[PDB]
Amino acid sequence: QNWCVQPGLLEFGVGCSPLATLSVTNSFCSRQLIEVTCNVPDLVRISPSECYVSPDGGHAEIDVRLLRSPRQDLLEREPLIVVSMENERISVPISFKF
């Protein structure tokens, strides 16, 4: 409603940059701290993982750098980037192309 994350999917692997970038837009009336995390440890390097975003449509750009491939076979969770802002969370799935 008051904020959003683009794109809606992060693509790594064959044909892709080793680097993906997220854009987080804050349309609340006040400046907001965000935290950007991954639901699988030691899978990506997120930079910066915390920053402030200006209100009224300000935005921050966040690098996501894949460190290893996910192991669905080793029953890791389906990998997600999670952005947290105010009391809310938006998840962005990660795909690795073979």
Numbering used by the authors: 1049 to 1146
What are the paper's exact sentences on this?
In flies and worms, the phosphorylation of Spd-2/SPD-2 at centrioles recruits Polo/Polo-like kinase 1 (PLK1), which then phosphorylates the large coiled-coil protein Cnn/SPD-5 to stimulate the assembly of a Cnn scaffold, and the internal molecular interactions that allow Cnn and SPD-5 to assemble into scaffolds are beginning to be elucidated. ASH domains are present in several proteins associated with centrosomes, cilia, flagella, and the Golgi complex, but the functions of these domains remain largely unknown.
An evolutionary analysis reveals that most Spd-2/CEP192 proteins contain additional ASH domains located close to the SP2D domain (one in Drosophila melanogaster and six in Homo sapiens; see Results). To partially validate the AF2 structural models, we solved the high-resolution structures of individual ASH domains from DmSpd-2 and H. sapiens CEP192 by crystallography (DmASH3 and HsASH7) to resolutions of 1.93 and 1.0 Å, respectively, or by nuclear magnetic resonance (NMR) spectroscopy (DmASH1). Instead, DmSP2D is essential for PCM scaffold assembly, a function that does not appear to require the additional ASH3 domain. Fusions in which the SP2D or its constituent individual ASH1 or ASH2 domains were deleted all failed to rescue the sterility of Spd-2−/− females, but the ASH3 deletion rescued this sterility nearly as well as the WT protein, although more variably. In contrast, Spd-2-∆ASH3-GFP was present at centrosomes at only slightly lower levels than WT Spd-2-GFP, and it appeared to be distributed more evenly between the centrioles and PCM than the WT protein. A 3D-SIM FRAP analysis suggested that Spd-2-∆ASH3-GFP was initially recruited to centrioles and then spread outward into the scaffold more quickly than the WT protein. Collectively, these data indicate that the SP2D and ASH1 and ASH2 are required for Spd-2 and PCM scaffold assembly in vivo, while ASH3 is not. In flies, the single additional ASH domain is not essential for the Spd-2 function (as Spd-2-∆ASH3-GFP can rescue the female sterility of Spd-2 mutants) nor for Spd-2 scaffold assembly or for targeting Spd-2 to the centriole/centrosome.
